[PDB]
C-alpha cells in the first residue's frame, strides 16, 4: 500500500456545483437564480419574513414565565436515570460513579426512575420515583437516599 | 562584505570546464564584483575597434574574456594537481590556503 493507492471511496469526495460558467454546464448565465427580483440579486430571512403581512410567529401569543432581571434562579435540578441503565453495574451505585460513565450529567442531582428491572443493588441517589422505589425494595435493592 | 573567492592573481589555475576545458594559466586578474577571472591565453575574443589614435587602420584586437570563477581550479605547486582549497592556521598564526591532497601551501 503506497501513496498512489490511497483513494477515497465512491462519493466520499464529490465535485462542487460550479454555476455561472457557460450554457452546456446547466447552470450558466442566470446561475440557477431565474429572472430578476431580490433572491436573484446579491442579498431576506425566509425563516421569518413573510411579505409585510403579520408573520406566522408574531400572531401566536406568549406562554408562561419568561423570567426577569437579574435572571434565572438557582435551585437544585434532577436528572433521572432508568433502572435498566443501572444494569451494567455491580455492588454500589452513586451519582459520582454514574457521571464518570456518562449517564448522569455533571451538576445534576440524581433521581432514579422506573423503566427497567431493579437490580439487587445499593443505589445512592438524590431522589427516587414511586415505581422505582417499590421495584428496588422488592428485588432486594438498597435505596440509600442522601441530601 | 567581500565576495568569497577561492582564487587569486596570479596563482596558476586549471580551466575545468567550457571551451578551454583543460587549458592552464596564471590569473592575470580577479573581478569579485563579477565573480569571474581573467586567465592568460584563455577565453580569447575577436574585438572590433574603430579607427582611432592607437589602432589607426582599426580592425580587430584580441582580449581575454573573463571566466566565471567557478570554472577555474587552482593548481597546487606540490602535487602539480588542481585541487580544492583548504585552510590551515599556522602557529604564526595566520591563515593560508592549502592543497586538498598534499598539504602543500597555496599562498
Amino acid at each position: 500500500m503506497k501513496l498512489s493507492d490511497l483513494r477515497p471511496n465512491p462519493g466520499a469526495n464529490k465535485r462542487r456545483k460550479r454555476v455561472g460558467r457557460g450554457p452546456g454546464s446547466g447552470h450558466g448565465k442566470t446561475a440557477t437564480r431565474g429572472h430578476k427580483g431580490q433572491k436573484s440579486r446579491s442579498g431576506k430571512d425566509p425563516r421569518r419574513f413573510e411579505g409585510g403581512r403579520s408573520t406566522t410567529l408574531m400572531r401566536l401569543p406568549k406562554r408562561g414565565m419568561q423570567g426577569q432581571v437579574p435572571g434565572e434562579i438557582k435551585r437544585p435540578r434532577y436528572q433521572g436515570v432508568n433502572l435498566k441503565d443501572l444494569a451494567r453495574f455491580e455492588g454500589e451505585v452513586t451519582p459520582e460513579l454514574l457521571v464518570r460513565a456518562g449517564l448522569l450529567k455533571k451538576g445534576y442531582r440524581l433521581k432514579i426512575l422506573g423503566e427497567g428491572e431493579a437490580k439487587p443493588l445499593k443505589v445512592v441517589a438524590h431522589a427516587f420515583s414511586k415505581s422505582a422505589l417499590e421495584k428496588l425494595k422488592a428485588a432486594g435493592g438498597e435505596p440509600v437516599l442522601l441530601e | 562584505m567581500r565576495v568569497k573567492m577561492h582564487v587569486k592573481k596570479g596563482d596558476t589555475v586549471l580551466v575545468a570546464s567550457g571551451k578551454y576545458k583543460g587549458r592552464v594559466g596564471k590569473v592575470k586578474e580577479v573581478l569579485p564584483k563579477k565573480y569571474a577571472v581573467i586567465v592568460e591565453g584563455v577565453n580569447i575574443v575577436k574585438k572590433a575597434v574603430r579607427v582611432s589614435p592607437k589602432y589607426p587602420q582599426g580592425g580587430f584586437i584580441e582580449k581575454e574574456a573573463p571566466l566565471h570563477a567557478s570554472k577555474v581550479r587552482p593548481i597546487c605547486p606540490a602535487c602539480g594537481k588542481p585541487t580544492r582549497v583548504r585552510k590551515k592556521f599556522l602557529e604564526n598564526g595566520k591563515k593560508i590556503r592549502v592543497c586538498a591532497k598534499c598539504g602543500g601551501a597555496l599562498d
Partner: protein
Amino acid sequence: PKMKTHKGAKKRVKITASGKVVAMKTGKRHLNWQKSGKEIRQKGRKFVLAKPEAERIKLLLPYE
C-alpha cells in the same frame, strides 16, 4: 458567527419530543364575553402547527 436563537419564538412555542412545533391557540386574549365556553375551553389547548411553518420556526431554534 453562531446563530442566535430567535427569542420571539423561544417565548411562544415549544418543539416536541418527536419534532412537532406546539403553540397556544389564538383567539381569547380579550373580546371574550359573548364567546361560548366551548370556544374559550378549546382555545386553552396547545395545538400543532401545520408542517410547512413548523419547519421554519424549527430553524430559529437551533439549540433546543
